[PDB]
Design a binder for this molecule. Structure first.
Ligand code: 2PG
Ligand code: 2PG
Ligand code: MG
Ligand code: MG
Lengths: 426, 437
């Protein structure tokens, strides 16, 4: 039985409060931290005198005073994650988890999952593999590393949000990490040399954000850095456009200079096609806005690369079903706190796998020292993880955790490599 | 009886390899990760790097990891030392290395075993690490939670820009608790970040190695005005003080005995280079104008004359970092010459927990303050949080409230604070003397 459930406020990587939950069982303490339009509703305090309104005292209170005591009295076996998460949603009673807070619910859900793994005597990724029905051997994910940032994070005209390197040709996860780390060091030096010493400072996810004007300008910098590291042809490129940030819905046009020409979705698709034929771009996330379903489907029809829903799908089985039915995208960016329980997150992955989607387990821009998503990526056999540049330990702690899993599993794990889109069946 | 000692390579917060060590006992797995500095002093214990320029730009730690797995690990298991006898362990680790600067097996190889064994020793006692370190250091109860010195504006070798001084810190010492001090600093930091973007552009909001904003500014006066304005916007003027880590060894021109406040720009202007007297005048002017309560490395690592000259006139905290390199022999010299009145304690500058504790005890003996410190290359490891509490130092330096290699330490003290309740007190305004609080 659970002997203790207790939450507290801790700080995420941006300096904002977030929820940490302890679940104590006979196997010890099991801890999880929650990261930070159609997303599950996180509960913030809204006291403008406290953390600028971003406190989580009410969500922590909901764990300590409401969820905790109820779950203990309900006396659910901690291995039965589905039953735990069903009970959590029953307690909340709202579709968007706005009664108790999605951050309150997820914190309990993730901490109980670790208690369940411990009860089974297996690490969390093995437990998640059981919960998700993924086969052996385990698949280690290709890291999609956001080394250069634009859009809302940068000061140049560059509208696209994230430029990533993809070390998919490496024989092992460990070698892929070394490759990406070496490329990143080259890029940081290039950014400082070509744009000034201030260009080496990093944004929220550990990448640089110089004053870049065009997408080709950013891709050439990455291309140059891959070459200096000696990995041209061994490392691919991915993008997170976050096009919702510059979609003018009234005119159905996209503003590539939204921080200072506007493109229809057909013209923006032409630009992606031109970039994808010139650069080794194997994955594009949110190329069109979160409700611009016609644009996604138009783009899906012609594209042989990965098309990742983020704001489009918000880890939400209802939005995934729509995207499957309308053939809008072929991969899911899985953010557990967008849906708010581990079971619903696993279902979202399962629903994506059923349509032969790739699944890229993802961090949030506000991360913590928590490494749960590393185990989630391995347990889901997703073969892809998006958890930042190789910089800032809220990003690297996830990578370090996969290094530990890699070493622990030895031959019972294989690197997804170039098959990351289909790694669940690799 | 240790059942297993195993090291691996992991990545620190700058993306460089470092050593992580597992020690497995009856109580389970105990793990520690070694940090890595950027503005490293010449006298620090020797960090063993691979130097293979085709791998991590030469910064691999495979050789250090091998030393743990092949040499240190098996020798420590066979020696069968009780894991809670930290002194005997660190005595044995140093005997194995046999050199003064730990250049044989590597200070990063040695420290990882030292800290992982320390967590094993704490667990055999059934107490948290901070309580075990309090036993080892002989520090009294109740526990003292440290004032977080928060480097919210980065300069020097930690960030890109024209700012010579390395670190500008806020010091929430008036707060009634550690938890409230953290909220105050977090609120100031958010005001500062928005203010830096407004006055210097969106790029000024990007952060340096330790999570502080790095606006392209020239003088310390500009950095201090920005922090002052942020403190006022957050409503904490008079409640939060300011500290600096000049890291002046980075811009000391040793041959001419001058200090270059524009060392980032090849624009020499050697007439703008300052003698230590002129640099001391600058510190005095800043300390009389701003609420500066602590200045770290105001003069170079072997400019003992400058330190002593400054110490004589200064009532604020003067912190040795590169001067003392957490080294009892250098601390003795600084005591004898009256060079500084506080130790910046970096465990990986000396390479074992026991020597680090000795460095703190030697400092306390001269009524020094002790500020437990991160390195600029940090990890998800939180050991220094338990060290700061265990040593009753009352001050910690572990970053801006930004980037989780910094916040993980602060979060760990939040957990200690909640765990201890009334059995702990916030050092507050008495951080310089917290060991005797
Ligand atoms: O857009 C994304 O993929 C991530 C950031 O990488 O989302 P968020 O910023 O909302 O956490
Ligand atoms: O100079 C310092 O005080 C430290 C921590 O801020 O930096 P580094 O680890 O690079 O020496
Ligand atoms: Mg996105
Ligand atoms: Mg220093």
């Amino acid at each position: 039985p659970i002997s203790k459930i207790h939450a507290r406020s801790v700080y995420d990587s941006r300096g904002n409060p977030t929820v940490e939950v302890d679940v104590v069982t006979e196997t010890g303490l099991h801890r999880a931290i929650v990261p930070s339009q159609h997303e599950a509703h996180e509960l913030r305090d809204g006291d403008k005198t406290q953390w600028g309104g971003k406190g989580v005292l009410k969500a922590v209170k909901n764990v300590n005073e409401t969820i905790g005591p109820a779950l203990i009295k309900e006396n659910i076996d901690v291995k039965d994650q589905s039953k735990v998460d069903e009970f959590l949603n029953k307690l909340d009673g709202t579709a968007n988890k706005s009664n108790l807070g999605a951050n309150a619910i997820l914190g309990v859900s993730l901490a109980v999952a670790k208690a369940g793994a411990a009860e089974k005597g297996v690490p969390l990724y093995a437990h998640i593999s059981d919960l998700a029905g993924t086969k052996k051997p385990y698949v280690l994910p290709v890291p999609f590393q956001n080394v250069l940032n634009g859009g809302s994070h940068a000061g140049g005209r560059l509208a696209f949000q994230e430029f990533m390197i993809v070390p998919d040709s490496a024989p092992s996860f460990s070698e892929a990490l070394r490759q990406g780390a070496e490329v990143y060091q080259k890029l940081k030096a290039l950014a400082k040399k070509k744009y000034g010493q201030s260009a080496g400072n990093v944004g929220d996810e550990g990448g640089v954000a110089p004053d870049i004007q065009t997408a080709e300008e950013a891709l050439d910098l990455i291309t140059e850095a891959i070459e200096q590291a000696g990995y041209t042809g061994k490392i691919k490129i991915a993008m997170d456009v976050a096009s919702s940030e510059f979609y003018k819905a009234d005119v159905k046009k996209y503003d590539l200079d939204f921080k200072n020409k506007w493109l229809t979705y057909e013209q923006l698709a032409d630009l992606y096609k031109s970039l994808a034929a010139k650069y080794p771009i194997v994955s594009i996330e949110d190329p069109f806005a979160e409700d611009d379903w016609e644009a996604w489907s138009y783009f899906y029809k012609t594209s042989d690369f990965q098309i990742v829903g983020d704001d489009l799908t918000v880890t939400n089985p209802g939005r995934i079903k729509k995207a499957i039915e309308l053939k809008s995208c072929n991969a899911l960016l899985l953010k557990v706190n967008q849906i708010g329980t581990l079971t619903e997150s696993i279902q979202a992955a399962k629903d994506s796998y059923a349509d032969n989607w790739g699944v890229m387990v993802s961090h949030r821009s506000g991360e913590t020292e928590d490494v749960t998503i590393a185990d989630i990526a391995v347990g889901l056999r997703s073969g892809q993880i998006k958890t930042g540049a190789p910089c800032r330990s809220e990003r690297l702690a996830k990578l370090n955790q996969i290094l530990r899993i890699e070493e622990e599993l030895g031959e019972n794990a294989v690197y997804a490599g170039s098959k990351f889109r289909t790694a669940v069946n690799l």
